[PDB]
Amino acid sequence: MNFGQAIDHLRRQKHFSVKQICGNYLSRQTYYRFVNNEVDISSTKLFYLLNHLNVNVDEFLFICNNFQLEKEFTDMEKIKIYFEKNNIVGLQNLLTSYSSQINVKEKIIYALISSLLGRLTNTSSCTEEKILRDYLINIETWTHYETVLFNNAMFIFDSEFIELIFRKINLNLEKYSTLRYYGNESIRMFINMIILYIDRQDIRRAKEALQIAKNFKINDDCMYEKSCIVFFNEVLNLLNGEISSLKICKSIIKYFNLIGSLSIAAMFESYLDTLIKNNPHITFN
Amino acid sequence: MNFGQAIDHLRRQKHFSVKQICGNYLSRQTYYRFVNNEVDISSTKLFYLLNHLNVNVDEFLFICNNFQLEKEFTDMEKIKIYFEKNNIVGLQNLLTSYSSQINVKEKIIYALISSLLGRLTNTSSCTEEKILRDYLINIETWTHYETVLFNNAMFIFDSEFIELIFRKINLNLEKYSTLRYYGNESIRMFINMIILYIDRQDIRRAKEALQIAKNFKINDDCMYEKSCIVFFNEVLNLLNGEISSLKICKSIIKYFNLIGSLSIAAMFESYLDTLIKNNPHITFN
């Protein structure tokens, strides 16, 4: 649905007048033609209109795309799942649709799908891993896109590279602490790094990664994140030998189950069972 | 900082080329003058540029405003605090800055500050409560703005009005369930309603409000919200007589304390102490 329709739909749903929203920045003729998709409007005049509608741009865009997040971000979660479940078919299908590679955006995801398919078919995707590596290593302002991309690409990279990326994003990651669903998505990626380091028996960089995640300024309502911080800290303690930390891991699992986070309680249940299995000294007496 | 500078700062921080971002939709001369704030650009061409920067508009705007949420939303949290703490001075100061009332936005917050000052000085603000009531009652697309406004205005309104608003927003509130920090802010307002109904000894509409909040589709990572749902449900059970529900309320408090949500654990601690004090039958044996 084009911007003209969405603005007018929001204007009528909030019982506003064209004058109330257009003020003395836009004409009725200018406003009408915009509604019918005859004319575009300067960006400062769109934000003016949204400002007077009392509507945020992210809310706006999420209506213009028929109540759906943007295709790149939704394709990125599909990619995540298809690789988890060894779904070569979904991966191969997403590879076809991005094979166009019209812009940088289509090259990164192309390279991401090829590189994950390479891992599933034990084939070289030397070119495509290089595209990904070069894009990520030259990010000095790290946004949501790179965070989504990095949660998804992380495990194809050697630990020196992951450490490089982690050390090099601390700063900006902090700046948007006040950002909604971004500050929190930054933390979740740090947990993914800790998980991946713990899983690679590279405990030394997991300790350094967690201590950084603790120093991140975390609002007391960010309870999934604060839970992850605590859980994984006790999991590090366990690996340094303390069965006192196993009760704390179990109690965090019980509390997920108490509040009906049953699917997440089971993921942590499976992880702590998988952790005791691979390092049996944790539980020893 | 104007849009031109922000785009170019993001472009250089991500080591992109003017051609990579401008593609064949914008000229170098057009792009440069935009950077120097000589020319604006059509809204579809700004979103094009942000799309190629791999940056979301909300992220973008949060950089253009020097890493700060928009003044209206930050003024709204200040208003919340100043009313909690009986700070007539901050309220009176915010009233001065909006006394301009240039647009709808400045009229709503003006009316909100006057109405909260009226409650603190036991004076009539009959005109201003009417402005607020009329704005809220005619919202068929309920956005974040109205949610922030309503958390803040809620308690000046009779319970029939609050029920009216609650029944009338279920639908749209659901649509943006997938929305980040919005779906979740919708739930928190529902808890505020439940709190306010429980506090007005109007248990009957608290039961109806909670049952609706339970039917809301809540992702398992939304743990502060799922915790609130569970806590307040057991608090309703308590009020219908079951000391079995008091252990569950205490365990949810203990888990906030375990994960370092110490300020939120104390708020719930104080509330359950204040709840037992006003309805002593809860604990009875």
Numbering used by the authors:
A (entry chain A), B (entry chain A): 1 to 285
Sentences from the paper on this structure:
NIP is expressed during high bacterial population density, secreted, reimported into the cytosol, and recognized by NrpR, which leads to upregulation of sar-BGC. During environmental acidification, SAL cytosol is acidified, which is sensed by a pH-sensitive histidine switch in the cytosolic transcription regulator, NrpR.
To elucidate the molecular mechanism of pH sensing by NrpR, we determined the crystal structure of cytosolic receptor NrpR (amino acids 1–285) to 2.6 Å resolution, the first full-length structure of an LCP receptor. The crystal belonged to the I21 space group, and each asymmetric unit has an NrpR dimer. The TPR motifs form a super-helical structure in the CTD with an exposed concave surface. Contrary to this, the side chain of H144 is located at the bottom of the predicted NIP-binding pocket of NrpR and positioned to influence NrpR-NIP interactions in response to pH alterations.
